[PDB]
Amino acid sequence: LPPRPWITLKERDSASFTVMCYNVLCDKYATRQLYGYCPSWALNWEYRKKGIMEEIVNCDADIISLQEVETEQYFTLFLPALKERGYDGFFSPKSRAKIMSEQERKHVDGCAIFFKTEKFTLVQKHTVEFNQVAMANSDGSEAMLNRVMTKDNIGVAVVLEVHKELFKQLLIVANAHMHWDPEYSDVKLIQTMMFVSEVKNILEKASIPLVLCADLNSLPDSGVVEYLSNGGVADNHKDFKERITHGFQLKSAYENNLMPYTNYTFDFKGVIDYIFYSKTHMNVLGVLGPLDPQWLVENNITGCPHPHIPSDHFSLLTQLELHP
Numbered sequence: 001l002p003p004r005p006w007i008t009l010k011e012r013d014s015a016s017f018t019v020m021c022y023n024v025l026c027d028k029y030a031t032r033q034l035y036g037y038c039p040s041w042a043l044n045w046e047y048r049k050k051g052i053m054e055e056i057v058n059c060d061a062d063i064i065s066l067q068e069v070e071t072e073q074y075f076t077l078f079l080p081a082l083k084e085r086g087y088d089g090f091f092s093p094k095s096r097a098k099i100m101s102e103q104e105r106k107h108v109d110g111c112a113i114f115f116k117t118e119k120f121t122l123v124q125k126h127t128v129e130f131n132q133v134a135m136a137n138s139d140g141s142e143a144m145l146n147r148v149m150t151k152d153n154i155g156v157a158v159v160l161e162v163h164k165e166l167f168k169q170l171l172i173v174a175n176a177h178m179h180w181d182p183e184y185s186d187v188k189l190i191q192t193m194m195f196v197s198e199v200k201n202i203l204e205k206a207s208i209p210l211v212l213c214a215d216l217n218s219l220p221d222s223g224v225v226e227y228l229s230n231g232g233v234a235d236n237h238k239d240f241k242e243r244i245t246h247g248f249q250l251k252s253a254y255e256n257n258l259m260p261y262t263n264y265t266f267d268f269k270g271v272i273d274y275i276f277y278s279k280t281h282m283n284v285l286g287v288l289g290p291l292d293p294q295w296l297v298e299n300n301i302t303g304c305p306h307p308h309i310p311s312d313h314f315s316l317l318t319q320l321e322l323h324p
């Protein structure tokens, strides 16, 4: 495995810090049926978890957003290992309201945010359950109830205090994992709108910089990305299949095609994971760029996971500069 290159975009000098966003691929969906091209011994969680940890540890981000973190893995692996490195963390599973055995409850995945206690102090934590937000806002709309409310997805957010010696300063970090099905671009879009307006809100109760990490399951051309990038989208955008605006001014850390793919499978490759930040308060100094395509080609790797790549997503990592 060759080092992915750093791509520097702006020079320093304010407070700099790094953010990692990584979908880890939970054990429950790591099957031969979905990943036929990868040996069982390399799919097995005992094997893959080492690679996942190594990835996270060596990125050594100040802020880590993870998706597809298994509940029991959060308590017995991610959190104790990352505490050992100076982090604290917040986790919520999906399906909290769903009835299931204790066994099944250990295996349910969710979203985690972690942060260096040396650099940040946790002030507030929130969980946003898209099913419940959909139901409370259905309004005699049949699509909402049948299509959105039936999707079990979530987002989490923390309010953090940025330690003044890095320059009472606040930062909101939000992590989400939208529904995956490309037949459901409307759900993806609506889940994004609910997430953004639920975040605008957290922002009221406690003008405050925002970092948004997500597995959006949406291409850069999509209505969801259009909506996050341009502050709004038209109510008749084709992605709704069946103008809406937001208050933030956000940019993608990796915009203008810096990676060709974040998710990498035999059947599908493209950019679907993102780190967005509020441009009024921050710049990107740099990003961790793509794994070298020659290396993948030379090693005959057209899908992940693989023995040297422990997930079917690649991590994103960005350095940002924050101003008061």
Ligand SMILES: Nc1ncnc2c1ncn2[C@@H]1O[C@H](COP(=O)(O)O)[C@@H](O)[C@H]1O
Pocket (backbone or CB within 6 Å): 099, 100, 101, 102, 103, 104
């Ligand atoms: N301890 C439990 N609490 C709640 N539901 C349970 C429990 N045990 C079994 N169930 C129900 O039985 C289904 C299958 O259980 P299991 O065979 O243990 O996976 C679960 O999805 C639940 O609907």
Ligand SMILES: Nc1ncnc2c1ncn2[C@@H]1O[C@H](COP(=O)(O)O)[C@@H](O)[C@H]1O
Pocket (backbone or CB within 6 Å): 023, 179, 180, 181, 182, 215, 217, 218, 219, 263, 265, 268, 272
């Ligand atoms: N925008 C999209 N277009 C086509 N397929 C997608 C898209 N987003 C997700 N997928 C599919 O869903 C998978 C991502 O699942 P997840 O692990 O939830 O991100 C991809 O590997 C594709 O199979």
